[PDB]
């Protein structure tokens, strides 16, 4: 997240870390929303690569014990049918993660709200984006969890040749682009929470930037609008 603020600890709790081991450590590459004790939402693109991949609940500092941390390994990953690794740009960048144990609920590990199916939001609606990604345009990750405020930007506006165009499809929600705040390296895979009916609600899964960089002015961060994907979400969760 680049022009954020430190999160309040655990004022997220839906929030995961998505971990590769490497080597005999481990290694933060993707954010995800814990929505069931034993499902993970997460982009697709993420989980691209075969290696081994672990998630971490009631994380806030990845580099020291915090005291509220659970780790559990992955058991099974279910990428959309329809992604394509090579076009980004078409969609269909949402998996979901099957874990090999229950995590438990309490304070700090709380299950992500997700929106009813079809829902879209008016332009500039509220909205803020977490993670551990990069704090600056090819810098570094973040060692707290970080947030940032990012309203919506409706289709209408950016699908506009002036933002994004035809990069963009209505499958997508846009955010930010203030050339100030944006999700980043890292970011990936995590969610966007709403405030909708004074409930917050997990809109949107952190799918691509610019190619020129992070934060740049009418290049809103883009996300998976999860919206569009509820009757996938329910079929496979209630199958596997
Ligand atoms: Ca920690």
Same mark, same amino acid.
């Given at each position: 997240?680049?022009? #954020? ?106 299950? #992500? ?48 040749? $002036?933002?994004? #165009?035809?990069?963009?499809?209505? $499958? ?69």
């Amino acid at each position: 997240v680049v022009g #954020g603020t430190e999160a309040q600890r655990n004022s997220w709790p839906s929030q995961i870390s998505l971990q590769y081991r490497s080597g005999s450590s481990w290694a933060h590459t993707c954010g995800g929303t814990l929505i069931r004790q034993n499902w993970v939402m997460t982009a697709a693109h993420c989980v691209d690569r075969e290696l081994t991949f672990r998630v971490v609940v009631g994380e806030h500092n990845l580099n020291q014990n915090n005291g509220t941390e659970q780790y559990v390994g992955v058991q099974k990953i279910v990428v959309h049918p329809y992604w394509n690794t090579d076009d980004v740009a078409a969609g269909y960048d949402i998996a979901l993660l099957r874990l090999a144990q229950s995590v438990t609920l309490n304070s700090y590990v709380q299950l #992500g709200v997700l929106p009813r199916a079809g829902t879209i939001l008016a332009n500039n609606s509220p909205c803020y984006i977490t993670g551990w990604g990069l704090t600056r345009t090819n810098g570094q990750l973040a060692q707290t969890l970080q947030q940032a405020y990012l309203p919506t930007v409706d289709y209408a506006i950016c699908s506009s040749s $002036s933002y994004w #165009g035809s990069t963009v499809k209505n $499958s997508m929600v846009c955010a930010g682009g203030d050339g100030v705040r944006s999700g980043c390296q890292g970011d990936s895979g995590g969610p966007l929470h709403c405030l909708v009916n004074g409930q917050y609600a997990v809109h949107g899964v952190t799918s691509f930037v610019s190619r020129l960089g992070c934060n740049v002015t009418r290049k809103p961060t883009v996300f998976t609008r999860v919206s569009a994907y509820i009757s996938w979400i329910n079929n496979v969760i209630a199958s596997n």
